[PDB]
Amino acid sequence: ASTDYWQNWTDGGGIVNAVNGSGGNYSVNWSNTGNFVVGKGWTTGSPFRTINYNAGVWAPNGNGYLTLYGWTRSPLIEYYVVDSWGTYRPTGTYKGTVKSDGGTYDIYTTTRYNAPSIDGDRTTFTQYWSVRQSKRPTGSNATITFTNHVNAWKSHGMNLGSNWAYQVMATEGYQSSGSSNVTVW
Ligand SMILES: *[C@H]1OC[C@@H](O[C@@H]2OC[C@@H](O)[C@H](O)[C@H]2O)[C@H](O)[C@H]1F
Incomplete structure (x- = not known):
């Protein structure tokens, strides 16, 4: 599919050279950064979307995630589907597991x-995660059948908002x- 959204956010720290490539392709060179999120995807996320991607290059030197990334409103939720990472594997409160792709x-x-969000300024919000047990x-x-994750989260009381914001395959660093x-389609 054709991506129609370009995500490029940085808190201003360090160097983040984000390149908006042809089609669903993009690249990122970063060094001594703060927090940042770069990726390509869709302006309006969907719980039934099947995301395809190919990371021709994945070379984090420290904390970095290769993950599906998106938001919803009502309520405000930041979600993730982490396929790979650098030196730090993200974790939190364990809810269960899901087999997919x-x-x-x-x-x-x-x-x-008190963190930044899509609504600007700062606020408190919940984060939903799906982290591969191994990179x-x-x-x-690669394929990410998001519907499998959405359904698994629901069975654990993890319901997403009714207002869908952007949805992208991104690179996050800290x-x-x-x-x-990465190339997304
Ligand atoms: C999850 O990822 C980074 C950050 O989200 C950003 O907030 C500001 C908004 O304009 C950008 O589009 C978002 O990517 C959030 O604090 C963190 F929890």
């Missing part, structure tokens, strides 16, 4: 306090350095 993911919930190999055509090149 050849891998097993742990389900977690966390909370952010997914990159360089191949006080680290690295490189990535």
